Amino acid sequence: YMRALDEYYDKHFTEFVPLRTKAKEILQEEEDLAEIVQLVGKASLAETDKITLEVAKLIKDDFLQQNGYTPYDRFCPFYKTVGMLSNMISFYDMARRAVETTAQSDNKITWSIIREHMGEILYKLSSMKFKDPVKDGEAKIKADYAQLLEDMQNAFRSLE
Amino acid sequence: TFGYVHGVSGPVVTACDMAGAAMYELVRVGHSELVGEIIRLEGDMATIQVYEETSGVSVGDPVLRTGKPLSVELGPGIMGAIFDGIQRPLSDISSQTQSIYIPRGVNVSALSRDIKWEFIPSKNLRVGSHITGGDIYGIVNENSLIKHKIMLPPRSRGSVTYIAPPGNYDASDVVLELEFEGVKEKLSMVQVWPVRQVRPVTEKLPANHPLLTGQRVLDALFPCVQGGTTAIPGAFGCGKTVISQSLSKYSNSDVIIYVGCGERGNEMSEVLRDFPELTMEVDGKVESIMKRTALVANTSNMPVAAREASIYTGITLSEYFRDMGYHVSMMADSTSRWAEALREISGRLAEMPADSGYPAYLGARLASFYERAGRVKCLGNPEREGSVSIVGAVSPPGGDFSDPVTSATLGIVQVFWGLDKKLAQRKHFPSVNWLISYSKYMRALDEYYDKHFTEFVPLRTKAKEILQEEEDLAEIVQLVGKASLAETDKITLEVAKLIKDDFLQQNGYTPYDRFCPFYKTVGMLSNMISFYDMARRAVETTAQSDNKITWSIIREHMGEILYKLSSMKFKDPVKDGEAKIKADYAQLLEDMQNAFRSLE
Amino acid sequence: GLTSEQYHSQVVGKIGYIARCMQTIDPENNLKKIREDYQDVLIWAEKNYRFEEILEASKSGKCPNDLDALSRRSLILQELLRLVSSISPFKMKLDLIESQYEKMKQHVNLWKSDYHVKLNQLNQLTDYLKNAAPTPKNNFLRAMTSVLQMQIAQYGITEDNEGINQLFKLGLHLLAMANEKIDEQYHLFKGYVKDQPEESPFEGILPAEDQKILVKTMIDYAMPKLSSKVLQDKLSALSSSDVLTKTLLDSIDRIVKENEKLN
Amino acid sequence: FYRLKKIQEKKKIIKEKSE
Amino acid sequence: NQARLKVLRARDDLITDLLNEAKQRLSKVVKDTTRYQVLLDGLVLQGLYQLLEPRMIVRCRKQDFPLVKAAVQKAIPMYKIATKKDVDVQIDLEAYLPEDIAGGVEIYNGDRKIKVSNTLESRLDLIAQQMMPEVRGALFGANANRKFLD
Amino acid sequence: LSAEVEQATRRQVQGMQSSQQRNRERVLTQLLGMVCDVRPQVHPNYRI
Amino acid sequence: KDRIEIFPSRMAQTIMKARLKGAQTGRNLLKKKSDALTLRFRQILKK
Amino acid sequence: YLSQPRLTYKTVSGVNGPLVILDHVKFPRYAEIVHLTLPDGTKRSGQVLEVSGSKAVVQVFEGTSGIDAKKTSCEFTGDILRTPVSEDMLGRVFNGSGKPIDRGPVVLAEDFLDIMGQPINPQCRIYPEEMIQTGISAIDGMNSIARGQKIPIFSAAGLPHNEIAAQICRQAGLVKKENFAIVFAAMGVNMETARFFKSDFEENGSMDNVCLFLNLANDPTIERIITPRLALTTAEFLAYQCEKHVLVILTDMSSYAEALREVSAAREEVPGRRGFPGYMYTDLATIYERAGRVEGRNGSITQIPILTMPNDDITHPIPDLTGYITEGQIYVDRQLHNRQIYPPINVLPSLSRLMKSAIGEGMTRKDHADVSNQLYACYAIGKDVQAMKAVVGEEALTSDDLLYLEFLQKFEKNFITQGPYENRTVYETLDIGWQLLRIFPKEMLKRIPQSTLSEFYPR
């Protein structure tokens, strides 16, 4: 039903379809990389592969993992879903941009540098799932996710 | 005479009023006369497996009772004919019906009864002369190539009461009459033989003569014998077409019978398009191989009984032309498809599924089919000797030789020419892998080689050992590289390459080595093994000296000799007669001896 | 192998076939040795036994019924009959026929013998010439094969005659040689003629008319290469010869060679 | 397959019994 | 697509008009007493031949009862001659066909569980549906693309 | 072009009507002639 | 021993086919690793 | 013509599953089409599955629910199922049994053809030769289809094999360096996908060529059995009589195999291999082999069966026998699908046996074969280099390995990845192939003869 739902998404959640496409691509890349990480080793991975693996862990553990017994995650509104996925994919794209652009350059950037610099950003992306629509209204959740995006952009601008 | 349809369900038609019907007999059901086989009897109720689609067959429809089981119709007109697995003359059905389909329940005679044949009776035969089954009582000039010898059927005998004078006769004309115990038999030029019954012969002699094909790899390393049994892998890029063409054009077989036995539509269309166009030079004239070839061609949508009986119709025609004194070469294009048809028939009959779904008798059927191949002292008075060489190909699933059909075929057959797609990609034609291939007729052909080609056997053994050594050294090359190889090992590798690229490899399109006479093949192998032996001798006998010889030294000194060895292929058997090619190879050997003597 | 009924039917048929072969090879009852050797099987053909009666005799064992021995003897007679028939126009002396019969009987295995192979080659040639249309290749083949048949009749196939071997080799090579290779055919025939010890290889063997056709064929191939009208008239005069001769071929060759030199 | 074939045979025999 | 379907609908309506005219013309053919008598004889005998039961009941329109009776009288002997089978043929005088039917008959067996409808409506429909290729070719011309008929 | 499609449809309908009118009489004559022509006959499989 | 001792079943057949493909992929990757190591090893030996 | 009246029977002896066993039938005909009226007037169709004595076991197309003895009538039409075929059924939507479902009129027959047809004579079939371009680069430039080939598509449940089928139907045509038609048969296709097919073909403007047969999942299964035969009878009429190159797309042959299994169980036959009929090979051959060029006729029938490989098992009887009967395969990959590549056609396991007959000078172009071979070789090397890079690391790779990785990425992004409505002429496909081959220098294109590189490599 994705093809039939394209019309609904491109009018109500215009930005969601590319986010879903990139999320599926990232998950498949992680599936392809885990076989190799476990068969041979983790040392030979490129920086972009590390971004893919760690963003896939982020998405799997804190976007595709939903405990339905909690007050905050019993039902996740689609605005919450699309906002969370937008933040995760924005982080993915921007981190890949950093590592690729600084490749073949003196001030090289690696996944370790990003993780060490902004452990707070990763923690906030992880806690994004805790927003409770009942008390954290739609406007509040959207504003918080926009603030997270702003913090991500600022921290990457400082890194760059 | 006539039964009636009492019930119909799928292809199974139950017919009443069939008291006298015989098991496995053939019947014509319906008003369109669909072919059917009696597979059961119960009182007057005969159960019939109808070959063709039974839609429209209604209760009360007449069932004509053919008084024979599935029997091929043997006689003049076989040569150049295209038959279904049931003996339906596709080339005549298409002409008479002017349609692209095979009409349901077509009843066209297998051999034309209107065409006239020039029949010359045996000069010795008269009125009262004693005649016996298998006796040739006349010859028909079917082609400029094949003289069709008209023979009495087996199980027939007596004293001749009328033998026709030489003249033009058709298959319906009575050409002979005989009497035995007062019973008078009138024999036309066409007989009929059950396909599933082995045609009798006075004796089944051992196979002791090669089935030459012209391909050096097949003729030399893995020889087949007239009356042999061979298997060929069936794949996309394997190159079975080279084997089929070589057997059809250049082999010493007097006759060729090609059995489709259930090929794809366009795959069979390719064969029907190509085989008529192939030509062979006989008596200096370029005749068509269809003057001596028959095609039992049927695609995968034909009646399953047609596909399953294709092998038997082909082998019965081949046995017929063996009994005439000829050497026939039957080629089942893929026995795997025949085995699938057999499994389908078993499933339709609801028989217990044996190993991996195949029937409980697949091995027995394959063995009994391949047992019909061989060289025989043909039945009949004129002392003859014929043979049937079955070259039936098989299709291993994904290259696995472990399925029931491939396993049974490899257990039964005595030769395996193991075509490989890997070598085809490497552009090594013919693509016989020359490592998985094998031939169990070497001990049978030892006598023939020792009589005509005394030196061939040691040459072949040495060539095979060279190739095995090269295969074993391929791993050592990986482990330690080429620089770590001894001089003897370098010689082995660089003569194994010579044999691979300049002896086994052969281009079927060139005018010079499209067909390689066995004398040429043995000459080339003799020169190659002579080079190998003298190089090895030089290396071994200079290992004790400080001026030790190396393969590099020999190559530098005798690049000319190596070039001549590579160019031995390019001798034309036609223009460069046997004498000239032999003399040139002897001169080459003289030059190698001179060069080695000077170097050593 | 064979059921008893069919085995004894084969025995009867083979006795009849041996009788027919004897009748065909020696209708005049001149091959006394052979007929004596085949007396035990020809006795059942001399008297008018019906198939049923002779079959009963074979079943009882009264008549020879060892189908392997009958096959061997029938083949010994059949190869001799083939030898006699392949040279049909050229009869063979009774002494020669009897000697070759003894040689065939002595042979261990006829179906692998050199005599059988030589007969197969001669039969190839005879069969081809039985229907081939008149052409230079076919005329050359007929001439060489007729000479070969004469040599076979006058010597026999049970020896290593160099003349017969040469004729076999050349005839088979010409037969296998392509139809259009006119030059190769003509030079093969010319080489054979030049290598025959006799000056007139085909004299008395072929009819005078076939001699004339053969010389006409040689002249036809010689003419188109000539340029001098005087030597062309000489060639035309030579074409009037009624017999082919080695010296006549040499004269034609010299005519064409002087024409070449004059060119 | 054996069980189903046996069941079919028994059904045929029962049908004959009823007929 | 709508235009293609509309022209096809127009063609189908023309065919339906032709078949309605055929119905209305058969309803006038029935009024020819001699021709309708011959037709009724044919239809009754045809139903008898299709059915082949020992006992038969012919159902027909009330106004057609005389003719049908005559037909039966003519069919009983011919049938006996053609099949060699003794036959009884009654005419249902208690339940006739609807008066608005064009004509024809309906032959039931003794127990009425097998019926053969030889009414002019059914016969015309059965003939026309098989004729449709010929009617198409004649009314709207043959297909220039169709080169082979087999 | 939509009006062109409509006009083409109308032209096709008129052509069909004319081609019908041309052969309608013979079509109907043949159809009714073969409807009236009965030819009663028993089933071919009937045997006595 | 000879067999993994998974009870015959279509699920078991699928699991074993997946395991065979995974083992073959791991073998090929380790063979490529060995090829790279051997190439560098022979380069260092020549050096 | 059948002039005799139809016989109607109230002698229903029994009802069992989908079967109505009637008794006292006059010379029952096997496979007869029979129209039965229920007690309440509902009309249904049926086919005489089996015949015995005076009995007749009628498999009803619809269910037997509501059918009863003593009141259900059953009129035997006296003839087997014959379909009305014409050229006007090109641009129409029919259900499984041939009844139009586009609100158009019933087919005004040009002929009445038996659906089972007859086997094309092997001696009359001709080698397919020229090419039918589907507009899809992944199969035009690497698995091209000859005029007369039978090349199935293999996929699993959930992959876009139906979307690829619709794309091929919308774009299929002759190379073009009005004699083409498409006969789309959909079997066991849920309502959503049937509506997708119908609306797509209607909207995209290709309906003038397409005859569409839709057998929904909840439509009778015997209708599913007779759907491919209707489609191929129409294809044979259009190709071998109207002389136009037909392309038959038979969707979800797995659903057809399921219907075949259901009918076999209805006949009370024992299951064969993996639960399917033993004669499934013959039935699939009967369907597929109604294809190919023929002697003396300018039309043809190409076939593209589509299969849902159950459990992604290539050894399953349906894909196995289809590969045994057909002449190629186009693999729809779950990995490419997950990576969001469309069409997710994997070109390594896919194959087209008769590609060589469908390419070359005068058919597609001089360089088609060489470009295809080089593209396949470079793609395989690129996959190998990805596997190597995964072990050695990006730095350890040589320049040629980087070139191969770049070609792999740009090949999956430009050649394979196409988009549903991107129709590429085979010349466009070859131009893209050359754009991708110009990543490497002339020397690494070892599978392209220099005669071709000197002409097409530059620019």
Coordinates of C-alpha atoms in Angstrom, one line a residue, chain B residues 6-11 53-60 82 90-91 93-94 98-104 235-236 262-270 272-273 297-302 304 307 336-337 340-341 343-344 347-348 350 356-357 395 397 427, chain H residues 27-31 49-53 80 114 116-128 148-150 236 240-241 267 270 273 278-282 285-286 289-295 297 321 323-327 351-354 356 447:
Chain B
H6 CA -18.4 -45.9 -21.2
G7 CA -16.8 -43.1 -19.3
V8 CA -14.3 -40.3 -19.5
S9 CA -12.2 -38.6 -16.7
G10 CA -9.1 -36.6 -17.7
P11 CA -7.1 -38.7 -20.2
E53 CA -6.8 -34.2 -25.1
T54 CA -10.1 -36.0 -24.4
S55 CA -12.3 -32.9 -24.3
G56 CA -15.4 -33.5 -26.4
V57 CA -15.2 -37.3 -26.2
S58 CA -18.7 -38.4 -25.2
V59 CA -20.2 -41.7 -24.0
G60 CA -21.1 -44.0 -26.8
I82 CA 10.6 -35.9 -39.2
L90 CA 5.1 -33.9 -38.8
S91 CA 6.6 -33.0 -42.1
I93 CA 1.0 -33.6 -41.4
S94 CA 2.0 -29.9 -42.0
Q98 CA -1.7 -26.7 -44.4
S99 CA -1.8 -25.7 -40.7
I100 CA 0.7 -24.9 -38.0
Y101 CA -0.9 -27.2 -35.5
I102 CA -1.2 -31.0 -35.3
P103 CA -4.9 -31.8 -35.7
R104 CA -6.4 -33.7 -32.7
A235 CA 23.4 -27.2 -20.6
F236 CA 23.1 -23.8 -22.3
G262 CA 10.6 -33.6 -25.3
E263 CA 12.7 -30.6 -25.9
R264 CA 11.6 -27.0 -25.6
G265 CA 9.7 -25.5 -28.5
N266 CA 12.4 -23.2 -29.9
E267 CA 15.1 -25.6 -28.8
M268 CA 13.6 -28.2 -31.1
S269 CA 13.0 -25.6 -33.8
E270 CA 16.7 -25.0 -33.8
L272 CA 14.8 -29.0 -37.1
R273 CA 16.2 -25.9 -38.8
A297 CA 11.3 -34.7 -32.9
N298 CA 8.7 -33.6 -30.4
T299 CA 8.4 -30.6 -28.1
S300 CA 7.2 -30.5 -24.4
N301 CA 3.5 -29.9 -25.1
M302 CA 3.2 -33.1 -27.1
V304 CA 3.3 -37.4 -22.6
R307 CA 7.6 -38.1 -25.3
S336 CA 16.1 -36.2 -18.6
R337 CA 13.0 -35.0 -20.4
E340 CA 10.3 -36.6 -16.7
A341 CA 7.7 -37.9 -19.1
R343 CA 7.5 -39.8 -14.0
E344 CA 4.5 -38.0 -15.3
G347 CA 2.0 -40.1 -11.5
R348 CA -1.0 -40.3 -13.8
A350 CA -1.0 -43.3 -9.4
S356 CA 12.8 -38.6 -5.5
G357 CA 9.5 -39.0 -7.3
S395 CA 20.8 -33.0 -18.0
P397 CA 20.3 -30.4 -12.2
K427 CA 36.9 -20.4 -25.7
Chain H
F27 CA -24.7 -39.4 -24.1
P28 CA -22.8 -37.1 -21.7
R29 CA -19.9 -35.2 -23.3
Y30 CA -16.7 -34.8 -21.4
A31 CA -15.8 -31.2 -20.7
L49 CA -15.5 -32.8 -15.0
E50 CA -16.1 -36.6 -15.4
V51 CA -18.5 -38.8 -17.4
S52 CA -19.6 -42.4 -16.7
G53 CA -22.4 -44.4 -18.2
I80 CA -17.1 -27.8 -25.0
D114 CA -11.7 -24.1 -28.6
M116 CA -7.6 -25.9 -25.3
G117 CA -6.1 -25.3 -28.7
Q118 CA -3.7 -27.7 -30.5
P119 CA 0.0 -28.1 -30.1
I120 CA 2.0 -26.0 -32.7
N121 CA 3.7 -28.3 -35.1
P122 CA 7.4 -28.5 -34.3
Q123 CA 8.2 -28.7 -38.0
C124 CA 6.2 -25.4 -38.5
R125 CA 7.8 -23.4 -35.7
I126 CA 10.6 -21.1 -36.5
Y127 CA 13.5 -19.8 -34.4
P128 CA 12.3 -16.5 -32.8
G148 CA 8.9 -16.1 -29.9
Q149 CA 10.8 -16.7 -26.7
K150 CA 9.3 -17.8 -23.4
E236 CA -3.0 -17.4 -31.2
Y240 CA -1.2 -16.7 -36.4
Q241 CA -4.3 -15.3 -38.1
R267 CA -11.1 -35.1 -9.4
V270 CA -3.7 -38.2 -5.1
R273 CA 5.3 -33.9 -5.8
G278 CA 1.9 -35.2 -11.2
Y279 CA 0.9 -33.9 -14.7
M280 CA 1.6 -30.3 -13.8
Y281 CA 4.6 -30.4 -16.1
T282 CA 2.4 -31.3 -19.1
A285 CA 4.0 -27.1 -21.1
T286 CA 0.6 -26.8 -22.7
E289 CA 4.4 -23.9 -25.6
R290 CA 1.6 -22.0 -27.3
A291 CA 4.2 -19.6 -28.3
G292 CA 6.9 -18.8 -30.9
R293 CA 7.2 -17.9 -34.6
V294 CA 5.6 -20.2 -37.2
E295 CA 6.4 -20.9 -40.8
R297 CA 3.0 -16.3 -40.9
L321 CA 9.1 -27.0 -14.2
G323 CA 12.5 -23.3 -16.0
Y324 CA 12.4 -26.8 -17.6
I325 CA 9.8 -25.6 -20.1
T326 CA 10.8 -21.9 -20.7
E327 CA 14.0 -20.4 -22.1
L351 CA 19.4 -15.2 -18.1
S352 CA 17.8 -15.1 -21.6
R353 CA 18.8 -18.2 -23.6
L354 CA 17.8 -16.6 -26.9
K356 CA 21.8 -13.7 -29.1
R447 CA 35.1 -8.5 -23.6

